[PDB]
PDB file of all heavy atoms in Angstrom:
ATOM      1  N   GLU X   3     197.963 -88.254  -2.284  1.00 26.70           N
ATOM      2  CA  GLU X   3     197.628 -88.467  -3.684  1.00 26.70           C
ATOM      3  C   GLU X   3     197.688 -87.146  -4.436  1.00 26.70           C
ATOM      4  O   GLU X   3     197.317 -86.098  -3.903  1.00 26.70           O
ATOM      5  CB  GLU X   3     196.239 -89.088  -3.831  1.00 26.70           C
ATOM      6  CG  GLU X   3     196.148 -90.531  -3.367  1.00 26.70           C
ATOM      7  CD  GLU X   3     194.859 -91.198  -3.805  1.00 26.70           C
ATOM      8  OE1 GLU X   3     194.089 -90.566  -4.558  1.00 26.70           O
ATOM      9  OE2 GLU X   3     194.617 -92.353  -3.397  1.00 26.70           O
ATOM     10  N   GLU X   4     198.152 -87.208  -5.683  1.00 23.31           N
ATOM     11  CA  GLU X   4     198.397 -86.022  -6.496  1.00 23.31           C
ATOM     12  C   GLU X   4     197.799 -86.237  -7.878  1.00 23.31           C
ATOM     13  O   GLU X   4     198.119 -87.225  -8.546  1.00 23.31           O
ATOM     14  CB  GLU X   4     199.899 -85.737  -6.593  1.00 23.31           C
ATOM     15  CG  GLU X   4     200.282 -84.657  -7.587  1.00 23.31           C
ATOM     16  CD  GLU X   4     201.779 -84.418  -7.630  1.00 23.31           C
ATOM     17  OE1 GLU X   4     202.492 -84.960  -6.760  1.00 23.31           O
ATOM     18  OE2 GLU X   4     202.244 -83.691  -8.532  1.00 23.31           O
ATOM     19  N   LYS X   5     196.934 -85.317  -8.305  1.00 22.72           N
ATOM     20  CA  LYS X   5     196.318 -85.392  -9.624  1.00 22.72           C
ATOM     21  C   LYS X   5     196.292 -84.010 -10.259  1.00 22.72           C
ATOM     22  O   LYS X   5     195.937 -83.027  -9.606  1.00 22.72           O
ATOM     23  CB  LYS X   5     194.893 -85.955  -9.554  1.00 22.72           C
ATOM     24  CG  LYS X   5     194.206 -86.029 -10.912  1.00 22.72           C
ATOM     25  CD  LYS X   5     192.759 -86.480 -10.801  1.00 22.72           C
ATOM     26  CE  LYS X   5     192.096 -86.512 -12.172  1.00 22.72           C
ATOM     27  NZ  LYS X   5     190.668 -86.930 -12.105  1.00 22.72           N
ATOM     28  N   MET X   6     196.656 -83.940 -11.538  1.00 23.19           N
ATOM     29  CA  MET X   6     196.685 -82.674 -12.256  1.00 23.19           C
ATOM     30  C   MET X   6     195.313 -82.360 -12.842  1.00 23.19           C
ATOM     31  O   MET X   6     194.624 -83.245 -13.361  1.00 23.19           O
ATOM     32  CB  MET X   6     197.741 -82.706 -13.364  1.00 23.19           C
ATOM     33  CG  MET X   6     197.471 -83.711 -14.473  1.00 23.19           C
ATOM     34  SD  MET X   6     198.979 -84.462 -15.113  1.00 23.19           S
ATOM     35  CE  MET X   6     199.460 -85.484 -13.720  1.00 23.19           C
ATOM     36  N   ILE X   7     194.912 -81.094 -12.740  1.00 22.72           N
ATOM     37  CA  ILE X   7     193.634 -80.666 -13.301  1.00 22.72           C
ATOM     38  C   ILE X   7     193.756 -80.444 -14.801  1.00 22.72           C
ATOM     39  O   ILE X   7     193.092 -81.112 -15.603  1.00 22.72           O
ATOM     40  CB  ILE X   7     193.130 -79.397 -12.590  1.00 22.72           C
ATOM     41  CG1 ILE X   7     192.791 -79.693 -11.129  1.00 22.72           C
ATOM     42  CG2 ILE X   7     191.925 -78.826 -13.318  1.00 22.72           C
ATOM     43  CD1 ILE X   7     191.604 -80.605 -10.955  1.00 22.72           C
ATOM     44  N   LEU X   8     194.609 -79.503 -15.201  1.00 21.82           N
ATOM     45  CA  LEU X   8     194.830 -79.216 -16.609  1.00 21.82           C
ATOM     46  C   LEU X   8     196.265 -78.748 -16.797  1.00 21.82           C
ATOM     47  O   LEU X   8     196.910 -78.261 -15.864  1.00 21.82           O
ATOM     48  CB  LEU X   8     193.832 -78.173 -17.147  1.00 21.82           C
ATOM     49  CG  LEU X   8     193.928 -76.657 -16.888  1.00 21.82           C
ATOM     50  CD1 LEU X   8     194.258 -76.315 -15.439  1.00 21.82           C
ATOM     51  CD2 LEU X   8     194.890 -75.956 -17.848  1.00 21.82           C
ATOM     52  N   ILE X   9     196.760 -78.909 -18.019  1.00 21.92           N
ATOM     53  CA  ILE X   9     198.087 -78.451 -18.406  1.00 21.92           C
ATOM     54  C   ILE X   9     197.940 -77.645 -19.686  1.00 21.92           C
ATOM     55  O   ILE X   9     197.394 -78.142 -20.677  1.00 21.92           O
ATOM     56  CB  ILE X   9     199.068 -79.619 -18.609  1.00 21.92           C
ATOM     57  CG1 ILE X   9     199.225 -80.417 -17.312  1.00 21.92           C
ATOM     58  CG2 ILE X   9     200.421 -79.104 -19.082  1.00 21.92           C
ATOM     59  CD1 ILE X   9     200.149 -81.610 -17.435  1.00 21.92           C
ATOM     60  N   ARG X  10     198.421 -76.404 -19.667  1.00 25.57           N
ATOM     61  CA  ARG X  10     198.307 -75.513 -20.809  1.00 25.57           C
ATOM     62  C   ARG X  10     199.676 -74.957 -21.172  1.00 25.57           C
ATOM     63  O   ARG X  10     200.598 -74.928 -20.352  1.00 25.57           O
ATOM     64  CB  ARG X  10     197.330 -74.361 -20.532  1.00 25.57           C
ATOM     65  CG  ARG X  10     197.831 -73.349 -19.515  1.00 25.57           C
ATOM     66  CD  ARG X  10     196.816 -72.236 -19.301  1.00 25.57           C
ATOM     67  NE  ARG X  10     197.322 -71.196 -18.411  1.00 25.57           N
ATOM     68  CZ  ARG X  10     196.615 -70.139 -18.022  1.00 25.57           C
ATOM     69  NH1 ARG X  10     195.368 -69.980 -18.442  1.00 25.57           N
ATOM     70  NH2 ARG X  10     197.155 -69.240 -17.211  1.00 25.57           N
ATOM     71  N   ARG X  11     199.798 -74.523 -22.423  1.00 28.79           N
ATOM     72  CA  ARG X  11     201.015 -73.898 -22.933  1.00 28.79           C
ATOM     73  C   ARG X  11     200.687 -72.472 -23.353  1.00 28.79           C
ATOM     74  O   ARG X  11     199.923 -72.263 -24.302  1.00 28.79           O
ATOM     75  CB  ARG X  11     201.589 -74.686 -24.108  1.00 28.79           C
ATOM     76  CG  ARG X  11     202.886 -74.110 -24.659  1.00 28.79           C
ATOM     77  CD  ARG X  11     203.245 -74.723 -26.002  1.00 28.79           C
ATOM     78  NE  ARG X  11     202.304 -74.340 -27.051  1.00 28.79           N
ATOM     79  CZ  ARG X  11     202.479 -74.600 -28.343  1.00 28.79           C
ATOM     80  NH1 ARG X  11     203.564 -75.245 -28.749  1.00 28.79           N
ATOM     81  NH2 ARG X  11     201.572 -74.213 -29.230  1.00 28.79           N
ATOM     82  N   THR X  12     201.251 -71.500 -22.646  1.00 28.47           N
ATOM     83  CA  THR X  12     201.098 -70.093 -22.971  1.00 28.47           C
ATOM     84  C   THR X  12     202.298 -69.618 -23.786  1.00 28.47           C
ATOM     85  O   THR X  12     203.347 -70.263 -23.822  1.00 28.47           O
ATOM     86  CB  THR X  12     200.959 -69.264 -21.693  1.00 28.47           C
ATOM     87  OG1 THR X  12     202.203 -69.276 -20.981  1.00 28.47           O
ATOM     88  CG2 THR X  12     199.880 -69.863 -20.811  1.00 28.47           C
ATOM     89  N   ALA X  13     202.141 -68.464 -24.429  1.00 29.76           N
ATOM     90  CA  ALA X  13     203.162 -67.967 -25.342  1.00 29.76           C
ATOM     91  C   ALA X  13     203.334 -66.467 -25.176  1.00 29.76           C
ATOM     92  O   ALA X  13     202.353 -65.718 -25.212  1.00 29.76           O
ATOM     93  CB  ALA X  13     202.806 -68.296 -26.796  1.00 29.76           C
ATOM     94  N   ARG X  14     204.578 -66.036 -24.986  1.00 31.53           N
ATOM     95  CA  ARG X  14     204.934 -64.626 -25.010  1.00 31.53           C
ATOM     96  C   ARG X  14     205.647 -64.303 -26.316  1.00 31.53           C
ATOM     97  O   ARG X  14     206.319 -65.152 -26.904  1.00 31.53           O
ATOM     98  CB  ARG X  14     205.827 -64.261 -23.823  1.00 31.53           C
ATOM     99  CG  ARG X  14     207.064 -65.133 -23.686  1.00 31.53           C
ATOM    100  CD  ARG X  14     207.956 -64.657 -22.550  1.00 31.53           C
ATOM    101  NE  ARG X  14     208.937 -65.667 -22.162  1.00 31.53           N
ATOM    102  CZ  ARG X  14     210.144 -65.788 -22.703  1.00 31.53           C
ATOM    103  NH1 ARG X  14     210.526 -64.961 -23.666  1.00 31.53           N
ATOM    104  NH2 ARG X  14     210.970 -66.736 -22.282  1.00 31.53           N
ATOM    105  N   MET X  15     205.495 -63.065 -26.775  1.00 30.81           N
ATOM    106  CA  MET X  15     206.105 -62.650 -28.029  1.00 30.81           C
ATOM    107  C   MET X  15     207.459 -62.001 -27.775  1.00 30.81           C
ATOM    108  O   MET X  15     207.620 -61.217 -26.836  1.00 30.81           O
ATOM    109  CB  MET X  15     205.192 -61.683 -28.784  1.00 30.81           C
ATOM    110  CG  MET X  15     204.091 -62.363 -29.581  1.00 30.81           C
ATOM    111  SD  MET X  15     204.753 -63.601 -30.713  1.00 30.81           S
ATOM    112  CE  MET X  15     203.622 -63.438 -32.095  1.00 30.81           C
ATOM    113  N   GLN X  16     208.434 -62.335 -28.621  1.00 31.38           N
ATOM    114  CA  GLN X  16     209.772 -61.773 -28.549  1.00 31.38           C
ATOM    115  C   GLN X  16     210.266 -61.578 -29.975  1.00 31.38           C
ATOM    116  O   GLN X  16     209.779 -62.219 -30.909  1.00 31.38           O
ATOM    117  CB  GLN X  16     210.712 -62.685 -27.739  1.00 31.38           C
ATOM    118  CG  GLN X  16     212.119 -62.150 -27.519  1.00 31.38           C
ATOM    119  CD  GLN X  16     213.139 -62.782 -28.448  1.00 31.38           C
ATOM    120  OE1 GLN X  16     212.845 -63.751 -29.149  1.00 31.38           O
ATOM    121  NE2 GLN X  16     214.350 -62.236 -28.454  1.00 31.38           N
ATOM    122  N   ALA X  17     211.225 -60.668 -30.146  1.00 28.19           N
ATOM    123  CA  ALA X  17     211.786 -60.434 -31.470  1.00 28.19           C
ATOM    124  C   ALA X  17     212.377 -61.726 -32.018  1.00 28.19           C
ATOM    125  O   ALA X  17     213.400 -62.211 -31.525  1.00 28.19           O
ATOM    126  CB  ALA X  17     212.845 -59.333 -31.423  1.00 28.19           C
ATOM    127  N   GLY X  18     211.735 -62.292 -33.042  1.00 23.97           N
ATOM    128  CA  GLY X  18     212.108 -63.579 -33.608  1.00 23.97           C
ATOM    129  C   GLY X  18     210.976 -64.589 -33.628  1.00 23.97           C
ATOM    130  O   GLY X  18     210.936 -65.449 -34.514  1.00 23.97           O
ATOM    131  N   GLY X  19     210.059 -64.499 -32.676  1.00 23.04           N
ATOM    132  CA  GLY X  19     208.919 -65.398 -32.654  1.00 23.04           C
ATOM    133  C   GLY X  19     208.308 -65.474 -31.265  1.00 23.04           C
ATOM    134  O   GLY X  19     208.567 -64.630 -30.408  1.00 23.04           O
ATOM    135  N   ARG X  20     207.489 -66.503 -31.076  1.00 19.65           N
ATOM    136  CA  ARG X  20     206.865 -66.744 -29.786  1.00 19.65           C
ATOM    137  C   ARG X  20     207.674 -67.750 -28.976  1.00 19.65           C
ATOM    138  O   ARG X  20     208.303 -68.659 -29.522  1.00 19.65           O
ATOM    139  CB  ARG X  20     205.428 -67.243 -29.956  1.00 19.65           C
ATOM    140  CG  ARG X  20     205.160 -67.965 -31.270  1.00 19.65           C
ATOM    141  CD  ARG X  20     203.708 -68.416 -31.352  1.00 19.65           C
ATOM    142  NE  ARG X  20     203.330 -68.829 -32.701  1.00 19.65           N
ATOM    143  CZ  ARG X  20     202.786 -68.018 -33.603  1.00 19.65           C
ATOM    144  NH1 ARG X  20     202.550 -66.749 -33.303  1.00 19.65           N
ATOM    145  NH2 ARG X  20     202.477 -68.478 -34.808  1.00 19.65           N
ATOM    146  N   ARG X  21     207.653 -67.569 -27.658  1.00 17.40           N
ATOM    147  CA  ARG X  21     208.347 -68.433 -26.715  1.00 17.40           C
ATOM    148  C   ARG X  21     207.337 -68.964 -25.710  1.00 17.40           C
ATOM    149  O   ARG X  21     206.539 -68.198 -25.156  1.00 17.40           O
ATOM    150  CB  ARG X  21     209.479 -67.680 -26.013  1.00 17.40           C
ATOM    151  CG  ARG X  21     210.466 -67.062 -26.987  1.00 17.40           C
ATOM    152  CD  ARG X  21     211.763 -66.662 -26.313  1.00 17.40           C
ATOM    153  NE  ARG X  21     212.770 -66.287 -27.299  1.00 17.40           N
ATOM    154  CZ  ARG X  21     214.020 -65.949 -27.005  1.00 17.40           C
ATOM    155  NH1 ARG X  21     214.429 -65.937 -25.743  1.00 17.40           N
ATOM    156  NH2 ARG X  21     214.863 -65.625 -27.974  1.00 17.40           N
ATOM    157  N   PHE X  22     207.377 -70.270 -25.475  1.00 19.30           N
ATOM    158  CA  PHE X  22     206.328 -70.962 -24.747  1.00 19.30           C
ATOM    159  C   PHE X  22     206.713 -71.177 -23.288  1.00 19.30           C
ATOM    160  O   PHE X  22     207.889 -71.304 -22.939  1.00 19.30           O
ATOM    161  CB  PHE X  22     206.017 -72.305 -25.411  1.00 19.30           C
ATOM    162  CG  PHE X  22     205.873 -72.222 -26.904  1.00 19.30           C
ATOM    163  CD1 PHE X  22     206.929 -72.562 -27.735  1.00 19.30           C
ATOM    164  CD2 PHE X  22     204.685 -71.802 -27.476  1.00 19.30           C
ATOM    165  CE1 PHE X  22     206.800 -72.486 -29.109  1.00 19.30           C
ATOM    166  CE2 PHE X  22     204.550 -71.724 -28.849  1.00 19.30           C
ATOM    167  CZ  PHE X  22     205.608 -72.067 -29.667  1.00 19.30           C
ATOM    168  N   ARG X  23     205.692 -71.215 -22.441  1.00 19.26           N
ATOM    169  CA  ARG X  23     205.839 -71.468 -21.015  1.00 19.26           C
ATOM    170  C   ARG X  23     204.628 -72.272 -20.570  1.00 19.26           C
ATOM    171  O   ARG X  23     203.491 -71.894 -20.860  1.00 19.26           O
ATOM    172  CB  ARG X  23     205.944 -70.162 -20.221  1.00 19.26           C
ATOM    173  CG  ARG X  23     206.318 -70.336 -18.755  1.00 19.26           C
ATOM    174  CD  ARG X  23     206.423 -68.992 -18.048  1.00 19.26           C
ATOM    175  NE  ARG X  23     207.488 -68.159 -18.601  1.00 19.26           N
ATOM    176  CZ  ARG X  23     207.717 -66.901 -18.239  1.00 19.26           C
ATOM    177  NH1 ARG X  23     206.949 -66.325 -17.323  1.00 19.26           N
ATOM    178  NH2 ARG X  23     208.709 -66.217 -18.792  1.00 19.26           N
ATOM    179  N   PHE X  24     204.870 -73.382 -19.885  1.00 16.97           N
ATOM    180  CA  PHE X  24     203.812 -74.319 -19.531  1.00 16.97           C
ATOM    181  C   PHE X  24     203.309 -74.070 -18.115  1.00 16.97           C
ATOM    182  O   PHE X  24     204.103 -73.917 -17.181  1.00 16.97           O
ATOM    183  CB  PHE X  24     204.303 -75.758 -19.669  1.00 16.97           C
ATOM    184  CG  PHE X  24     204.642 -76.150 -21.081  1.00 16.97           C
ATOM    185  CD1 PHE X  24     205.900 -75.901 -21.607  1.00 16.97           C
ATOM    186  CD2 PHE X  24     203.698 -76.768 -21.883  1.00 16.97           C
ATOM    187  CE1 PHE X  24     206.209 -76.264 -22.907  1.00 16.97           C
ATOM    188  CE2 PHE X  24     204.001 -77.136 -23.182  1.00 16.97           C
ATOM    189  CZ  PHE X  24     205.259 -76.881 -23.694  1.00 16.97           C
ATOM    190  N   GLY X  25     201.988 -74.035 -17.969  1.00 16.45           N
ATOM    191  CA  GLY X  25     201.354 -73.940 -16.670  1.00 16.45           C
ATOM    192  C   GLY X  25     200.534 -75.186 -16.399  1.00 16.45           C
ATOM    193  O   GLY X  25     200.036 -75.833 -17.323  1.00 16.45           O
ATOM    194  N   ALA X  26     200.410 -75.527 -15.119  1.00 14.76           N
ATOM    195  CA  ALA X  26     199.724 -76.753 -14.738  1.00 14.76           C
ATOM    196  C   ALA X  26     199.078 -76.589 -13.372  1.00 14.76           C
ATOM    197  O   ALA X  26     199.701 -76.061 -12.445  1.00 14.76           O
ATOM    198  CB  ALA X  26     200.689 -77.942 -14.727  1.00 14.76           C
ATOM    199  N   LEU X  27     197.832 -77.044 -13.259  1.00 12.80           N
ATOM    200  CA  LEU X  27     197.140 -77.133 -11.981  1.00 12.80           C
ATOM    201  C   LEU X  27     197.296 -78.534 -11.406  1.00 12.80           C
ATOM    202  O   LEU X  27     197.247 -79.526 -12.138  1.00 12.80           O
ATOM    203  CB  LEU X  27     195.657 -76.803 -12.138  1.00 12.80           C
ATOM    204  CG  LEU X  27     195.221 -75.362 -11.872  1.00 12.80           C
ATOM    205  CD1 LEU X  27     193.709 -75.238 -11.968  1.00 12.80           C
ATOM    206  CD2 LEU X  27     195.710 -74.912 -10.508  1.00 12.80           C
ATOM    207  N   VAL X  28     197.480 -78.609 -10.091  1.00  8.55           N
ATOM    208  CA  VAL X  28     197.698 -79.872  -9.394  1.00  8.55           C
ATOM    209  C   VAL X  28     196.986 -79.815  -8.051  1.00  8.55           C
ATOM    210  O   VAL X  28     197.152 -78.853  -7.292  1.00  8.55           O
ATOM    211  CB  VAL X  28     199.200 -80.168  -9.200  1.00  8.55           C
ATOM    212  CG1 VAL X  28     199.405 -81.199  -8.104  1.00  8.55           C
ATOM    213  CG2 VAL X  28     199.822 -80.649 -10.503  1.00  8.55           C
ATOM    214  N   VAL X  29     196.197 -80.845  -7.755  1.00  7.87           N
ATOM    215  CA  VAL X  29     195.544 -81.009  -6.465  1.00  7.87           C
ATOM    216  C   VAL X  29     196.222 -82.159  -5.734  1.00  7.87           C
ATOM    217  O   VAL X  29     196.594 -83.169  -6.346  1.00  7.87           O
ATOM    218  CB  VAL X  29     194.033 -81.274  -6.621  1.00  7.87           C
ATOM    219  CG1 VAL X  29     193.333 -81.176  -5.274  1.00  7.87           C
ATOM    220  CG2 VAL X  29     193.417 -80.305  -7.612  1.00  7.87           C
ATOM    221  N   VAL X  30     196.397 -81.994  -4.428  1.00  8.55           N
ATOM    222  CA  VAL X  30     196.966 -83.019  -3.563  1.00  8.55           C
ATOM    223  C   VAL X  30     196.014 -83.234  -2.395  1.00  8.55           C
ATOM    224  O   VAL X  30     195.465 -82.274  -1.844  1.00  8.55           O
ATOM    225  CB  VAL X  30     198.380 -82.638  -3.066  1.00  8.55           C
ATOM    226  CG1 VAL X  30     198.380 -81.254  -2.428  1.00  8.55           C
ATOM    227  CG2 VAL X  30     198.908 -83.682  -2.092  1.00  8.55           C
ATOM    228  N   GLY X  31     195.795 -84.492  -2.034  1.00 11.63           N
ATOM    229  CA  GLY X  31     194.864 -84.802  -0.967  1.00 11.63           C
ATOM    230  C   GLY X  31     195.159 -86.139  -0.336  1.00 11.63           C
ATOM    231  O   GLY X  31     195.663 -87.057  -0.989  1.00 11.63           O
ATOM    232  N   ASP X  32     194.835 -86.248   0.951  1.00 14.19           N
ATOM    233  CA  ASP X  32     194.941 -87.500   1.684  1.00 14.19           C
ATOM    234  C   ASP X  32     193.613 -88.238   1.777  1.00 14.19           C
ATOM    235  O   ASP X  32     193.562 -89.320   2.369  1.00 14.19           O
ATOM    236  CB  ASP X  32     195.487 -87.246   3.095  1.00 14.19           C
ATOM    237  CG  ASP X  32     194.587 -86.338   3.920  1.00 14.19           C
ATOM    238  OD1 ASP X  32     193.662 -85.724   3.349  1.00 14.19           O
ATOM    239  OD2 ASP X  32     194.804 -86.241   5.147  1.00 14.19           O
ATOM    240  N   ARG X  33     192.543 -87.670   1.217  1.00 14.49           N
ATOM    241  CA  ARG X  33     191.190 -88.221   1.287  1.00 14.49           C
ATOM    242  C   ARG X  33     190.692 -88.352   2.724  1.00 14.49           C
ATOM    243  O   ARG X  33     189.732 -89.083   2.989  1.00 14.49           O
ATOM    244  CB  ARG X  33     191.098 -89.570   0.562  1.00 14.49           C
ATOM    245  CG  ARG X  33     191.483 -89.500  -0.906  1.00 14.49           C
ATOM    246  CD  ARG X  33     191.403 -90.864  -1.569  1.00 14.49           C
ATOM    247  NE  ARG X  33     191.727 -90.794  -2.991  1.00 14.49           N
ATOM    248  CZ  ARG X  33     190.837 -90.542  -3.945  1.00 14.49           C
ATOM    249  NH1 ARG X  33     189.566 -90.337  -3.631  1.00 14.49           N
ATOM    250  NH2 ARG X  33     191.219 -90.496  -5.214  1.00 14.49           N
ATOM    251  N   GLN X  34     191.327 -87.644   3.661  1.00 13.53           N
ATOM    252  CA  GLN X  34     190.925 -87.658   5.058  1.00 13.53           C
ATOM    253  C   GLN X  34     190.299 -86.349   5.515  1.00 13.53           C
ATOM    254  O   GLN X  34     189.766 -86.293   6.629  1.00 13.53           O
ATOM    255  CB  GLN X  34     192.131 -87.978   5.956  1.00 13.53           C
ATOM    256  CG  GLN X  34     192.909 -89.225   5.556  1.00 13.53           C
ATOM    257  CD  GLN X  34     192.183 -90.513   5.893  1.00 13.53           C
ATOM    258  OE1 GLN X  34     191.147 -90.503   6.560  1.00 13.53           O
ATOM    259  NE2 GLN X  34     192.727 -91.633   5.433  1.00 13.53           N
ATOM    260  N   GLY X  35     190.348 -85.303   4.694  1.00 17.25           N
ATOM    261  CA  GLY X  35     189.795 -84.017   5.070  1.00 17.25           C
ATOM    262  C   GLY X  35     190.715 -82.859   4.747  1.00 17.25           C
ATOM    263  O   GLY X  35     190.382 -81.699   5.008  1.00 17.25           O
ATOM    264  N   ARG X  36     191.878 -83.162   4.178  1.00 17.08           N
ATOM    265  CA  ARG X  36     192.869 -82.160   3.811  1.00 17.08           C
ATOM    266  C   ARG X  36     193.031 -82.142   2.298  1.00 17.08           C
ATOM    267  O   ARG X  36     193.174 -83.199   1.674  1.00 17.08           O
ATOM    268  CB  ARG X  36     194.216 -82.447   4.477  1.00 17.08           C
ATOM    269  CG  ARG X  36     194.195 -82.388   5.992  1.00 17.08           C
ATOM    270  CD  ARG X  36     195.572 -82.671   6.578  1.00 17.08           C
ATOM    271  NE  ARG X  36     196.589 -81.760   6.059  1.00 17.08           N
ATOM    272  CZ  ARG X  36     196.856 -80.563   6.573  1.00 17.08           C
ATOM    273  NH1 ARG X  36     196.179 -80.125   7.626  1.00 17.08           N
ATOM    274  NH2 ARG X  36     197.800 -79.805   6.033  1.00 17.08           N
TER     275      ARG X  36
END
């Protein structure tokens, strides 16, 4: 099973404007102990 914690959009500055890059947390588990 796979569930995302949060999804955010970060921004770096470049000549002309800001450019976005998305980060995401994801947990995976079998509910058996892993």
Side-chain angles (χ1 to χ4, degrees):
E3 290 193 6
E4 171 180 350
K5 179 185 179 181
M6 64 216 70
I7 294 293
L8 77 316
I9 299 178
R10 70 180 185 183
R11 182 193 68 171
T12 68
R14 54 176 164 89
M15 278 306 215
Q16 184 258 350
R20 26 180 167 268
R21 304 196 170 183
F22 314 98
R23 189 179 297 174
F24 295 86
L27 265 184
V28 161
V29 191
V30 53
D32 61 348
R33 301 179 178 272
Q34 308 286 352
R36 297 181 56 86

